User: Fold Ferredoxin from Novosphingobium aromaticivorans.
Amino acid sequence: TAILVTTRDGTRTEIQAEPGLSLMEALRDAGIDELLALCGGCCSCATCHVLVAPAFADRLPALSGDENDLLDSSDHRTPHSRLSCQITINDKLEGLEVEIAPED
Amino acid sequence: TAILVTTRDGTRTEIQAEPGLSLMEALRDAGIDELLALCGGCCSCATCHVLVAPAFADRLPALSGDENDLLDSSDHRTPHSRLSCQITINDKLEGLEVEIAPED
Amino acid sequence: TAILVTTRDGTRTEIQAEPGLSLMEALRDAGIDELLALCGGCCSCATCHVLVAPAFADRLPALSGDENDLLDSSDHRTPHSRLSCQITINDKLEGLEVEIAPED
Amino acid sequence: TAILVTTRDGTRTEIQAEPGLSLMEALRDAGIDELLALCGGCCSCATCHVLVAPAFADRLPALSGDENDLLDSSDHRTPHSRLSCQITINDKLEGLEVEIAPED
Amino acid sequence: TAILVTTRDGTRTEIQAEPGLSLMEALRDAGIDELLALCGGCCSCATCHVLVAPAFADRLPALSGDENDLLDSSDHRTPHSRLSCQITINDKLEGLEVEIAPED
Amino acid sequence: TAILVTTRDGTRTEIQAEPGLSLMEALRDAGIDELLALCGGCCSCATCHVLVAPAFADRLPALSGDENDLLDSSDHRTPHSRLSCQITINDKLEGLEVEIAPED
Amino acid sequence: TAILVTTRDGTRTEIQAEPGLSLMEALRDAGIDELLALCGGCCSCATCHVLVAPAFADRLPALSGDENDLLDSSDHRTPHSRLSCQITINDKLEGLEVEIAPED
Amino acid sequence: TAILVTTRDGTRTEIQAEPGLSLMEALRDAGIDELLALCGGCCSCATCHVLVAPAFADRLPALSGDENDLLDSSDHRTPHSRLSCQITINDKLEGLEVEIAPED
Amino acid sequence: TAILVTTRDGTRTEIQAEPGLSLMEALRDAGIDELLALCGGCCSCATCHVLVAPAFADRLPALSGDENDLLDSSDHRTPHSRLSCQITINDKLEGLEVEIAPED
Amino acid sequence: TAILVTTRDGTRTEIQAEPGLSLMEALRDAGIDELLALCGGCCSCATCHVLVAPAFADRLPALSGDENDLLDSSDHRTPHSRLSCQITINDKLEGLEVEIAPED
Ligand code: FES
Ligand code: FES
Ligand code: FES
Ligand code: FES
Ligand code: FES
Ligand code: FES
Ligand code: FES
Ligand code: FES
Ligand code: FES
Ligand code: FES
Assistant:
């Protein structure tokens, strides 16, 4: 379904995201090459970090402790930070707005 | 989204499951009360344990290390075991078959 | 409030339990001397283990991962096992039935 | 059960809180939306962070190590900080004063 | 690049394996579907477990502590067990012999 | 049994301390209310932090790794910092001098 | 101060233990050579394992999580098991009855 | 196979690296003595730290959690940081550009 | 430098061992090939497992928590088990008796 | 056996050190009292911190993950920092240069 992604430089792109892939996988499939996924989507790094629009907090599954810990390593973490590889694409995310987190 | 659950007594029932809920939530919502979810779906127990049909293995997100350790506590873990509170409902799961794992 | 406690030997006792203390503290205040609380109610042992009546599962707060891990060390753990030092007494526990878990 | 909450803007409002719910649940239920509870009350984030009036310190259960580590991630932790999803409402909390911690 | 795999039935088949892939990926690409990778090759499960012929032990990088702990959870671990997703394919692996570990 | 405590304001007071109690318990019983024990003396917080006069270091049991990690979370840790709840009162502690560590 | 120790042969000695030492150190200074302290009293093995007489449980400091974990590795652990290097000798232990745990 | 390594002085060498070795071992056999391997390549220090040229990120195996944790201890970590003892040399690394990370 | 090494089959070589090396390193250098060192002596496996003669325990340094943890995974662990890779060769070990632990 | 120890103030004793002892033990036995060994050499503090001369790194055994973790807590840690209690004295250390790390 449709996700609006803002990259680090401010440019915005609408992407069509397949249900059942992770947000990280959808972003990379759409050529958002800047989103390193160094651990390969196994929740062991912070490089798939995105900032989720506050309106959408309720539409995402709860974050885990491991995801929370990894997000804390980043100096750009906010209450709305998520690891994109932890978010499964589904219809309830239709219209999701995310920003790629600044580096580190 | 239609899901076929085998309950502990071996009987099979199809349920509807809203995209974006966890499988555990979809299960309880549809009146499958067998499944305790003692930790309330926060990946801290093994009481939402399901067995997933092999044909669906690759349609689900990778299991996490925390999910994997919780499942090892169960004498009924098989390699198709999942914690259903770790699975987000989405159309790629259309037709999923799960069995409620025996108790313990 | 009122808790019905069965000891290891099968004898049953009604106790009046003060709100805000833990179940372990209430049990010990009532002279259930057999319930060792070796760590002192700091969730680091399994010796305040009780079996909670299934009817009451919904009336207790969710168990944590640490409590869950410690309960797994016990060969007598069941899906309804709780560490009594993790349960805060309050009106919603009125009539709670618990059994002191067998030793280990 | 009557609880006096100071919201982020410094204003004070008394709420009713049902015994057996967590403080975080009592807060949201009474329309205090300020408090995100990203992890959904499973002790895996720091977004339900409250500051408890000192006079009430000893009326609450001991904080856990997992709660303590989560709170250290916040630049606003004080020694009276608690995760409100870790506090069970009960009559001993009658008259509790809490302040919603600033964001981060 | 050429690797001889002994499947669970005991039959032996030679496969080609691209350098830079993991052994797990290579086995899976060559259609050894037997071998589940529940965690997706992120070293958090034990389903990619293979048994490495003793004569190649020297040719493999040191196993890590994390890999070692996951292998101990299997009843079929031997001192030559490896997680195939931890092994990078390179020419020093020419002719490697591995057996698919039994399930669980 | 006699211990000289320097409170946060810098004043010194001698207290009596029963053997077998923890230092934290003794300080609290003698009314040094300054000293919070948020975790209840279960070595899971840093609020019972005291600074031990160098001349008594030898007379105290070795600090544990867990105690060491909790002390590092305080900005006022020194190499003579101890968690007072980890210290058992005994006659070898006669005349022990401790300062209440500053907050946080 | 006086400790009654039952050695592995079932025989028992009353020893004098100096306040401030650990039970492990007291035992060894009294010549109970049975008792290995492989890690040398830093809570990293289970070789200083003793069984505490039920009547004295109350008289010792709370069990730690690390001590609890180490003790679970022993086939001879009971709910009254303690690591003797974790117990500080003091007047409250006067007349303590302990038994050296069988080996393993 | 050919690796272009930039040393801490900013100068750069093309080395030959034998397939199957780690990058750390390759580097050292080529005489890049700058690079300490304090723990000797068992993933327990951060002294074999290198920065991988962005174009090659894809060409390495996934980052592990342990490698991720170690790297965060370094003030010079960037999202392209890798521990060179964790990288197995293979044809897919042909022309790899790496820079030895500053010390610390 | 003299070590009495008893192998799995029962043969008893005496060997010279160079100070500063690990016992595992010594056993391999003297060509005792039985002793796999799967993790390459970075204290992450149990394959360098030996049984030390009781007379010598006190002449080795204290085992670590990590070494103790690895050793407990072995079904042949005894209170005298050591990971040979963790023992630095020195003159105080003159004439040490070790047996190679059975595999697993 | 000869160690060139430089203290915090800059004075440079040379000392004899007995094989089999830890470097910390040696420094204390030669009466270098600066070096607190708060945890009694069980690798749980950072107070036995020394700085090894770069010429000697390769003559010491690999540091452990645990030692590395403790050392990172020190604001004076350098890539040459070692916990002196973790270094077994042996002839290969003949003429080792160490500086006592500044406190904290
Ligand atoms: S890609 Fe590494 S945590 Fe998401
Ligand atoms: S409900 Fe506890 S892990 Fe799913
Ligand atoms: S008393 Fe130890 S866990 Fe409850
Ligand atoms: S809501 Fe996440 S810890 Fe309370
Ligand atoms: S696929 Fe899970 S560990 Fe290899
Ligand atoms: S009171 Fe929490 S650690 Fe001492
Ligand atoms: S001596 Fe090792 S734990 Fe007591
Ligand atoms: S050498 Fe220590 S982590 Fe690479
Ligand atoms: S070689 Fe793996 S622990 Fe000794
Ligand atoms: S003395 Fe504490 S780690 Fe060396």
